[PDB]
Amino acid sequence: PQVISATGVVKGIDLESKKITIHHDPIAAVNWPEMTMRFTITPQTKMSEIKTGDKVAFNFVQQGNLSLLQDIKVS
Ligand SMILES: [Cu+2]
Structure with a gap:
């Protein structure tokens, strides 16, 4: 239930497998x-x-x- 917010750079998109590969910045939470x-x-x-x-x-x-993923958009 804890929603975690993050930022990163997209490294790969595979919608067939339903996966977005993200190199994410540190997440303090x-x-x-x-x-x-x-x-x-x-x-x-x-x-x-x-x-x-x-x-x-x-x-x-x-x-x-x-x-x-709850949501994702270009920052
Ligand atoms: Cu991680």
Whole structure:
């Protein structure tokens, strides 16, 4: 339920697998350094037009072994 806000650069988009690979900036809320992670698109994810290399602002939740995207857009 904790919504986590982050920023990063998009490294790959695979909608077939429902994955956006993001090299994210440190996330203080969860004590994460910069990482590269795949973030999962759900049917309810608020998607904007994004492409590889885009600087993005996004929100996610940790659920199961997945990082579920709430929203993502070019920052
Ligand atoms: Cu991470």
